[PDB]
Short mmCIF file of C-alpha atoms and ligand atoms in Angstrom, two decimals:
data_model
loop_
_atom_site.label_atom_id
_atom_site.label_comp_id
_atom_site.label_asym_id
_atom_site.label_seq_id
_atom_site.Cartn_x
_atom_site.Cartn_y
_atom_site.Cartn_z
CA UNK A 1 -10.28 -36.22 -44.92
CA UNK A 2 -11.26 -32.58 -44.33
CA UNK A 3 -9.30 -32.96 -41.04
CA UNK A 4 -5.58 -32.23 -40.73
CA UNK A 5 -2.87 -34.75 -39.93
CA UNK A 6 0.19 -34.09 -37.77
CA UNK A 7 1.30 -37.62 -36.95
CA UNK A 8 0.03 -40.14 -39.56
CA UNK A 9 -2.50 -42.74 -38.28
CA UNK A 10 -1.90 -41.16 -34.80
CA UNK A 11 -2.82 -37.48 -34.42
CA UNK A 12 -5.69 -35.61 -36.00
CA UNK A 13 -6.87 -32.06 -35.65
CA UNK A 14 -10.46 -31.72 -36.74
CA UNK A 15 -10.83 -28.25 -35.33
CA UNK A 16 -13.12 -25.52 -36.68
CA UNK A 17 -14.44 -27.70 -39.55
CA UNK A 18 -18.17 -27.19 -38.94
CA UNK A 19 -18.99 -30.82 -37.93
CA UNK A 20 -22.42 -31.71 -36.61
CA UNK A 21 -21.38 -35.25 -35.79
CA UNK A 22 -18.27 -37.18 -34.73
CA UNK A 23 -16.17 -38.03 -37.82
CA UNK A 24 -15.49 -41.64 -38.75
CA UNK A 25 -13.33 -41.52 -41.88
CA UNK A 26 -10.36 -41.70 -39.51
CA UNK A 27 -7.99 -44.57 -38.49
CA UNK A 28 -9.32 -46.87 -35.74
CA UNK A 29 -5.83 -46.77 -34.20
CA UNK A 30 -6.01 -42.95 -33.68
CA UNK A 31 -4.47 -41.90 -30.37
CA UNK A 32 -4.98 -38.09 -30.30
CA UNK A 33 -8.13 -36.35 -31.57
CA UNK A 34 -8.89 -32.61 -31.41
CA UNK A 35 -12.52 -31.92 -32.31
CA UNK A 36 -12.84 -28.54 -30.58
CA UNK A 37 -14.90 -25.80 -32.26
CA UNK A 38 -17.57 -27.87 -34.03
CA UNK A 39 -21.40 -27.62 -33.57
CA UNK A 40 -21.45 -31.15 -32.09
CA UNK A 41 -24.28 -30.10 -29.70
CA UNK A 42 -25.20 -33.50 -28.25
CA UNK A 43 -23.27 -36.57 -27.14
CA UNK A 44 -25.44 -39.65 -27.47
CA UNK A 45 -24.36 -43.12 -26.35
CA UNK A 46 -21.36 -44.72 -28.14
CA UNK A 47 -20.37 -41.34 -29.67
CA UNK A 48 -16.76 -42.58 -29.90
CA UNK A 49 -17.18 -46.24 -30.85
CA UNK A 50 -14.75 -45.94 -33.78
CA UNK A 51 -11.66 -44.94 -31.72
CA UNK A 52 -11.24 -47.59 -28.99
CA UNK A 53 -7.55 -46.62 -28.80
CA UNK A 54 -7.82 -42.84 -28.07
CA UNK A 55 -5.57 -41.36 -25.40
CA UNK A 56 -6.33 -37.63 -25.59
CA UNK A 57 -9.60 -36.05 -26.72
CA UNK A 58 -10.50 -32.37 -27.13
CA UNK A 59 -14.13 -31.19 -27.25
CA UNK A 60 -13.59 -27.51 -26.25
CA UNK A 61 -16.36 -25.07 -27.18
CA UNK A 62 -18.43 -27.69 -29.06
CA UNK A 63 -21.83 -26.30 -27.87
CA UNK A 64 -22.56 -29.61 -26.08
CA UNK A 65 -25.55 -29.41 -23.74
CA UNK A 66 -26.24 -33.07 -23.06
CA UNK A 67 -24.00 -36.08 -22.50
CA UNK A 68 -25.71 -39.47 -22.08
CA UNK A 69 -24.95 -42.93 -20.64
CA UNK A 70 -21.89 -44.37 -22.37
CA UNK A 71 -20.91 -41.51 -24.73
CA UNK A 72 -17.30 -42.56 -23.99
CA UNK A 73 -18.17 -46.19 -23.28
CA UNK A 74 -15.31 -47.74 -25.26
CA UNK A 75 -12.48 -45.39 -24.34
CA UNK A 76 -10.66 -47.71 -21.92
CA UNK A 77 -7.35 -45.94 -22.61
CA UNK A 78 -8.45 -42.29 -22.39
CA UNK A 79 -6.04 -40.35 -20.15
CA UNK A 80 -7.16 -36.80 -20.96
CA UNK A 81 -10.61 -35.37 -21.71
CA UNK A 82 -11.01 -31.64 -22.38
CA UNK A 83 -14.59 -30.42 -22.23
CA UNK A 84 -13.85 -26.74 -21.65
CA UNK A 85 -16.60 -24.19 -22.36
CA UNK A 86 -19.70 -26.25 -23.17
CA UNK A 87 -23.10 -25.02 -21.87
CA UNK A 88 -23.78 -28.47 -20.41
CA UNK A 89 -27.21 -28.68 -18.76
CA UNK A 90 -28.37 -32.28 -18.59
CA UNK A 91 -25.55 -34.58 -17.59
CA UNK A 92 -26.45 -38.26 -17.45
CA UNK A 93 -25.70 -40.08 -14.19
CA UNK A 94 -23.41 -42.44 -16.19
CA UNK A 95 -21.90 -40.07 -18.76
CA UNK A 96 -18.28 -40.90 -17.81
CA UNK A 97 -18.79 -44.66 -18.10
CA UNK A 98 -15.90 -46.60 -19.63
CA UNK A 99 -13.29 -43.94 -18.94
CA UNK A 100 -11.41 -46.58 -16.93
CA UNK A 101 -7.96 -45.06 -17.42
CA UNK A 102 -8.90 -41.33 -17.20
CA UNK A 103 -6.20 -39.20 -15.59
CA UNK A 104 -6.83 -35.55 -16.48
CA UNK A 105 -10.38 -34.16 -16.76
CA UNK A 106 -10.89 -30.53 -17.80
CA UNK A 107 -14.44 -29.32 -17.10
CA UNK A 108 -13.65 -25.60 -17.18
CA UNK A 109 -16.50 -23.11 -17.79
CA UNK A 110 -19.04 -25.91 -18.32
CA UNK A 111 -21.83 -24.27 -16.34
CA UNK A 112 -21.09 -26.22 -13.12
CA UNK A 113 -22.88 -24.86 -10.01
CA UNK A 114 -22.14 -27.65 -7.51
CA UNK A 115 -19.82 -30.67 -7.56
CA UNK A 116 -22.60 -32.79 -6.13
CA UNK A 117 -24.22 -33.82 -9.41
CA UNK A 118 -20.82 -34.45 -11.00
CA UNK A 119 -20.68 -38.16 -12.05
CA UNK A 120 -16.93 -38.79 -11.66
CA UNK A 121 -17.07 -41.04 -8.61
CA UNK A 122 -16.13 -44.21 -10.48
CA UNK A 123 -13.07 -42.47 -11.97
CA UNK A 124 -10.57 -43.98 -9.51
CA UNK A 125 -7.65 -43.21 -11.81
CA UNK A 126 -8.24 -39.43 -11.75
CA UNK A 127 -5.11 -37.42 -10.87
CA UNK A 128 -6.30 -33.95 -11.80
CA UNK A 129 -9.72 -32.29 -12.13
CA UNK A 130 -9.92 -28.69 -13.37
CA UNK A 131 -13.24 -27.00 -12.72
CA UNK A 132 -12.07 -23.41 -12.82
CA UNK A 133 -14.34 -20.61 -14.18
CA UNK A 134 -17.66 -22.26 -13.34
CA UNK A 135 -20.56 -21.08 -11.19
CA UNK A 136 -19.74 -22.91 -7.98
CA UNK A 137 -20.70 -20.90 -4.87
CA UNK A 138 -20.61 -23.56 -2.19
CA UNK A 139 -17.58 -25.74 -2.75
CA UNK A 140 -18.29 -28.84 -0.79
CA UNK A 141 -16.55 -32.00 -1.90
CA UNK A 142 -19.25 -34.70 -1.83
CA UNK A 143 -18.83 -38.19 -0.51
CA UNK A 144 -17.83 -39.68 -3.88
CA UNK A 145 -14.42 -38.05 -3.39
CA UNK A 146 -13.45 -41.17 -1.38
CA UNK A 147 -12.83 -43.12 -4.57
CA UNK A 148 -10.58 -40.41 -6.01
CA UNK A 149 -7.75 -42.16 -4.19
CA UNK A 150 -5.29 -40.82 -6.82
CA UNK A 151 -6.42 -37.18 -6.99
CA UNK A 152 -3.54 -34.72 -6.70
CA UNK A 153 -4.54 -31.39 -8.20
CA UNK A 154 -7.97 -29.91 -7.77
CA UNK A 155 -8.54 -26.51 -9.34
CA UNK A 156 -11.54 -24.51 -8.14
CA UNK A 157 -10.36 -21.05 -9.17
CA UNK A 158 -12.49 -18.24 -10.63
CA UNK A 159 -15.77 -19.68 -9.39
CA UNK A 160 -18.29 -17.81 -7.24
CA UNK A 161 -16.98 -19.32 -3.98
CA UNK A 162 -17.47 -16.97 -1.02
CA UNK A 163 -16.85 -19.12 2.06
CA UNK A 164 -14.94 -22.12 3.27
CA UNK A 165 -16.98 -23.96 5.88
CA UNK A 166 -15.78 -26.88 8.00
CA UNK A 167 -17.89 -29.54 6.27
CA UNK A 168 -16.46 -28.49 2.88
CA UNK A 169 -13.27 -30.51 3.11
CA UNK A 170 -14.53 -33.17 5.56
CA UNK A 171 -14.24 -36.24 3.24
CA UNK A 172 -10.46 -35.83 3.19
CA UNK A 173 -10.19 -37.03 6.84
CA UNK A 174 -10.39 -40.63 5.61
CA UNK A 175 -8.02 -39.96 2.72
CA UNK A 176 -4.66 -40.32 4.58
CA UNK A 177 -2.48 -40.99 1.48
CA UNK A 178 -3.73 -37.78 -0.19
CA UNK A 179 -1.01 -35.59 -1.58
CA UNK A 180 -3.46 -32.91 -2.75
CA UNK A 181 -2.74 -29.52 -4.32
CA UNK A 182 -5.84 -27.29 -4.04
CA UNK A 183 -6.32 -24.14 -6.10
CA UNK A 184 -8.90 -21.63 -4.82
CA UNK A 185 -7.64 -18.34 -6.33
CA UNK A 186 -9.73 -15.60 -7.88
CA UNK A 187 -12.79 -16.55 -5.89
CA UNK A 188 -14.83 -13.80 -4.23
CA UNK A 189 -13.87 -15.28 -0.85
CA UNK A 190 -13.95 -13.17 2.30
CA UNK A 191 -14.56 -15.69 5.10
CA UNK A 192 -12.93 -18.90 6.37
CA UNK A 193 -14.76 -20.53 9.26
CA UNK A 194 -12.44 -21.71 12.08
CA UNK A 195 -11.45 -25.42 11.91
CA UNK A 196 -12.03 -25.64 8.15
CA UNK A 197 -8.54 -27.08 7.60
CA UNK A 198 -7.97 -29.11 10.81
CA UNK A 199 -6.88 -32.76 10.46
CA UNK A 200 -6.56 -32.43 6.63
CA UNK A 201 -3.59 -33.24 4.38
CA UNK A 202 -2.71 -30.56 1.80
CA UNK A 203 0.50 -30.55 -0.19
CA UNK A 204 -0.22 -27.12 -1.73
CA UNK A 205 -2.93 -24.50 -1.02
CA UNK A 206 -3.77 -21.36 -3.02
CA UNK A 207 -5.91 -18.64 -1.48
CA UNK A 208 -4.68 -15.63 -3.38
CA UNK A 209 -6.60 -12.84 -5.17
CA UNK A 210 -9.69 -13.50 -3.13
CA UNK A 211 -10.98 -10.87 -0.69
CA UNK A 212 -9.58 -12.14 2.60
CA UNK A 213 -9.01 -9.44 5.23
CA UNK A 214 -8.42 -11.85 8.07
CA UNK A 215 -8.23 -15.55 8.89
CA UNK A 216 -9.15 -17.30 12.13
CA UNK A 217 -6.45 -18.11 14.65
CA UNK A 218 -4.91 -21.54 14.17
CA UNK A 219 -6.52 -21.92 10.76
CA UNK A 220 -3.37 -23.68 9.46
CA UNK A 221 -1.75 -24.82 12.73
CA UNK A 222 -2.69 -28.46 12.19
CA UNK A 223 -2.20 -28.66 8.42
CA UNK A 224 -0.19 -31.77 7.46
CA UNK A 225 2.56 -31.78 4.82
CA UNK A 226 1.78 -28.31 3.50
CA UNK A 227 4.64 -27.41 1.17
CA UNK A 228 3.47 -24.30 -0.65
CA UNK A 229 0.86 -21.64 0.12
CA UNK A 230 -0.26 -18.48 -1.70
CA UNK A 231 -1.80 -15.55 0.12
CA UNK A 232 -0.82 -12.52 -1.98
CA UNK A 233 -3.24 -9.98 -3.47
CA UNK A 234 -5.68 -10.04 -0.58
CA UNK A 235 -6.96 -6.95 1.32
CA UNK A 236 -5.23 -7.99 4.57
CA UNK A 237 -6.30 -6.00 7.59
CA UNK A 238 -3.07 -5.40 9.53
CA UNK A 239 -4.59 -3.99 12.69
CA UNK A 240 -3.20 -5.55 15.88
CA UNK A 241 -3.97 -7.92 17.43
CA UNK A 242 -6.14 -9.21 14.54
CA UNK A 243 -3.17 -9.86 12.25
CA UNK A 244 -1.00 -11.29 15.06
CA UNK A 245 -1.52 -14.99 14.21
CA UNK A 246 -1.08 -14.82 10.44
CA UNK A 247 1.96 -12.58 10.87
CA UNK A 248 3.48 -15.07 13.27
CA UNK A 249 2.66 -17.99 11.00
CA UNK A 250 4.15 -16.43 7.88
CA UNK A 251 7.49 -15.98 9.69
CA UNK A 252 7.36 -19.45 11.17
CA UNK A 253 6.51 -20.74 7.65
CA UNK A 254 8.51 -18.44 5.37
CA UNK A 255 9.83 -21.26 3.17
CA UNK A 256 6.30 -22.34 2.30
CA UNK A 257 4.97 -18.89 1.26
CA UNK A 258 4.78 -17.97 -2.41
CA UNK A 259 4.81 -14.25 -3.09
CA UNK A 260 4.08 -12.01 -0.12
CA UNK A 261 0.89 -11.15 1.70
CA UNK A 262 0.78 -7.36 1.97
CA UNK A 263 -1.29 -5.06 4.17
CA UNK A 264 -4.22 -3.18 2.67
CA UNK A 265 -3.46 0.54 2.65
CA UNK A 266 0.08 0.04 3.95
CA UNK A 267 1.42 -2.32 1.24
CA UNK A 268 3.91 -3.63 3.82
CA UNK A 269 4.38 -7.42 4.05
CA UNK A 270 2.20 -9.12 6.63
CA UNK A 271 5.20 -11.10 7.89
CA UNK A 272 6.83 -7.79 8.89
CA UNK A 273 4.30 -6.92 11.61
CA UNK A 274 5.12 -7.51 15.26
CA UNK A 275 2.04 -7.03 17.41
CA UNK A 276 2.18 -6.10 21.10
C1 LIG B 1 1.49 -39.22 -0.64
O1 LIG B 1 2.33 -39.22 0.52
C2 LIG B 1 2.20 -40.42 1.27
C3 LIG B 1 2.60 -40.28 2.74
O2 LIG B 1 3.85 -39.65 2.86
C4 LIG B 1 2.98 -41.50 0.52
O3 LIG B 1 3.05 -42.69 1.31
C5 LIG B 1 4.38 -43.29 1.28
O4 LIG B 1 4.45 -44.30 0.30
C6 LIG B 1 5.75 -44.80 0.07
C7 LIG B 1 5.67 -45.64 -1.20
O5 LIG B 1 5.47 -44.78 -2.29
C8 LIG B 1 6.25 -45.57 1.31
O6 LIG B 1 7.59 -46.03 1.14
C9 LIG B 1 7.74 -47.48 1.31
O7 LIG B 1 8.67 -47.84 2.33
C10 LIG B 1 10.04 -48.14 2.03
C11 LIG B 1 10.89 -46.90 2.28
O8 LIG B 1 11.05 -46.76 3.67
C12 LIG B 1 10.29 -48.74 0.64
O9 LIG B 1 11.32 -49.70 0.67
C13 LIG B 1 9.00 -49.35 0.08
O10 LIG B 1 9.21 -49.98 -1.17
C14 LIG B 1 7.97 -48.23 -0.03
O11 LIG B 1 8.38 -47.35 -1.06
C15 LIG B 1 6.14 -44.66 2.54
O12 LIG B 1 6.33 -45.46 3.70
C16 LIG B 1 4.81 -43.86 2.65
N1 LIG B 1 4.81 -42.79 3.66
C17 LIG B 1 5.82 -42.44 4.47
C18 LIG B 1 6.24 -41.00 4.45
O13 LIG B 1 6.40 -43.22 5.23
C19 LIG B 1 2.26 -41.72 -0.82
O14 LIG B 1 3.12 -42.39 -1.71
C20 LIG B 1 1.73 -40.45 -1.53
N2 LIG B 1 0.48 -40.78 -2.21
C21 LIG B 1 0.01 -40.18 -3.31
C22 LIG B 1 -1.30 -40.71 -3.83
O15 LIG B 1 0.57 -39.24 -3.89
C1 LIG B 2 -19.42 -49.73 -9.36
C2 LIG B 2 -19.97 -49.86 -7.97
O1 LIG B 2 -21.11 -49.47 -7.71
N1 LIG B 2 -19.17 -50.42 -7.06
C3 LIG B 2 -18.81 -49.82 -5.77
C4 LIG B 2 -17.87 -48.62 -5.97
O2 LIG B 2 -17.94 -47.75 -4.85
C5 LIG B 2 -16.42 -49.02 -6.21
O3 LIG B 2 -16.18 -48.92 -7.60
C6 LIG B 2 -16.12 -50.46 -5.76
C7 LIG B 2 -14.62 -50.80 -5.65
O4 LIG B 2 -13.91 -49.94 -4.78
O5 LIG B 2 -16.85 -50.76 -4.58
C8 LIG B 2 -18.25 -50.89 -4.82
C1 LIG B 3 -1.00 -46.47 -41.00
O1 LIG B 3 -1.20 -47.70 -40.32
C2 LIG B 3 -1.99 -48.62 -41.06
C3 LIG B 3 -2.53 -49.72 -40.15
O2 LIG B 3 -1.50 -50.31 -39.38
C4 LIG B 3 -1.14 -49.14 -42.21
O3 LIG B 3 -1.88 -50.05 -43.00
C5 LIG B 3 -0.68 -47.97 -43.09
O4 LIG B 3 0.37 -48.41 -43.93
C6 LIG B 3 -0.23 -46.72 -42.31
N1 LIG B 3 -0.35 -45.57 -43.20
C7 LIG B 3 0.68 -44.95 -43.78
C8 LIG B 3 1.10 -45.43 -45.15
O5 LIG B 3 1.27 -44.02 -43.24
#
């Protein structure tokens, strides 16, 4: 092969080797294939017919614009699919067909602008979905998120997200077993509508390095099983009595905070402020 072998008959790195099509002079038993950095461009149906036993697949920066019905049709054991950095435009409404075991799906910087046309609804076995560094402005989990009854880390960081509205996290009301870590850092976010988080079950919640100056009263008060939160590196307005609630909450929830929310201008920790 022109590929490289790390574990014989098991692990192949076909990176950077100028491929225009999926290789095939490789063992049908292959469990780990890295194809990143090859002008693959398009993913027609049955693209991976010759590797029914693949567990991990890397297609990072492969210039892929289209993926069609059944490109991964015979990958019943795929656990991890890395699609990072492909200018995907057309995405077939059955592109993730036959990914029956899929656990980790990395769609980072793949030109996503809304999760709504994201055909992952039949991927019951999904545990983590990373859609950082896309073009999402309105982050509203669509209905299909019901099925994701195993989802436990959703990364939505470094998008274009400016607001959290109530509706956005609605679908999680009927997901009572959901132990869900939600990353929303490095968004240009300055506004959280009141009630956004009520009657929702978050294990972890990141809201740091946005542009939050304030949060509505009670925003977290009814937030089930929260274990960690991040609020640091935000321009917190520590005027009283605006900051009263968050200040109170951070003290009442000290164990859960990661880092420290500081006041803009001051630099003093938000938890340190006692309003009249
Ligand atoms: C996310 O958290 C939920 C809710 O806390 C988890 O539900 C819990 O599931 C366990 C089983 O994993 C239940 O324990 C069961 O009961 C007895 C122990 O008393 C044991 O003998 C049984 O064999 C069984 O393990 C537990 O009752 C239940 N919730 C609570 C706190 O009572 C769920 O596992 C988590 N789900 C995900 C998708 O991460
Ligand atoms: C494939 C399909 O259309 N079937 C639907 C789908 O929502 C889900 O896969 C199934 C089992 O929960 O219930 C029904
Ligand atoms: C790899 O596995 C194949 C198929 O089971 C076997 O025929 C072959 O001996 C192995 N290759 C070597 C020699 O590492």
